[PDB]
Request: fold
Amino acid sequence: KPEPTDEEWELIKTVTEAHVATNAQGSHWKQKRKFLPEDIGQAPIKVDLEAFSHFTKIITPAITRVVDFAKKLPMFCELPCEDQIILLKGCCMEIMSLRAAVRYDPESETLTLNGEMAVTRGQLKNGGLGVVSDAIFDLGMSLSSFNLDDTEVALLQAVLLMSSDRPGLACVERIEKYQDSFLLAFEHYINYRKHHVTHFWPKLLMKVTDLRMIGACHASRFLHMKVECPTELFPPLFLEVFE
Amino acid sequence: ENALLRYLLDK
Ligand SMILES: Cc1nc(C(=O)NCC(=O)O)c(O)c2ccc(Oc3ccccc3)cc12
Reply:
């Protein structure tokens, strides 16, 4: 099974450094994290306004970290500004959800958001995500045995970022080219890594689909939240994602 | 639109 070429090790370094530099709290997240109190994010009688309020306050930095991740990839910097915007809108919630899912802790049954806020399945559900909370937690549980490292997480992020089917893109072929560069480097890294999980590469590709489904469904939850919540309750960066 | 994203991307 082929291992990375020299050019692919160079890409692996670049992508991994970009992720590590932009992942909240880095290696100290578990020390930093504060458990959101249990009285926040309980089921109403719709949206628990206090949990919602907490989540809206941390969305802007989470999106901003994804922006910063992308800007550290020369391939992404080569794209026209309008393609950069469309790719960012498309992948932000996917990447943040991956970043939360890899911070699932079975001992507390929480994900950690923004490197500091540990939340339960119910809190994230009732704060606005609905079934998407379950999707992300499930994902997190299923990733525990995958033992993904920084590199593997970063490569999953780059694959999501370089998605040539986002609507309105101009550089569709160039963006597929970049994706396939990432995919090949990733498969070759996975081959080198020898995880003790059968059919690991096709299984990872199913996790990418799961993240794409999460991303799509955040839009759905936004529309549902806008029934109870005026748009001005959402931070303007989050509003831009969905316009 | 996309004003703020465009700012964050560009600078
Ligand atoms: C899916 C995800 N993730 C993160 C996150 O931090 N991920 C991990 C990280 O970036 O280190 C958030 O901070 C989120 C905040 C809000 C959110 O939706 C909502 C948006 C508005 C209202 C309610 C929930 C989803 C998030």
Notes: Residues A 24, 52, 55-56, 58-59, 62, 65, 93, 96-97, 99-100, 113-115, 127-129 surround 8HO (CB under 6 Å). Chain B touches chain A at residues 1-6, 8-10 (CB under 8 Å). The CA atoms of residues 4 and 10 of chain B lie 10 Å apart. Chain B is about 75% helix and 0% strand.
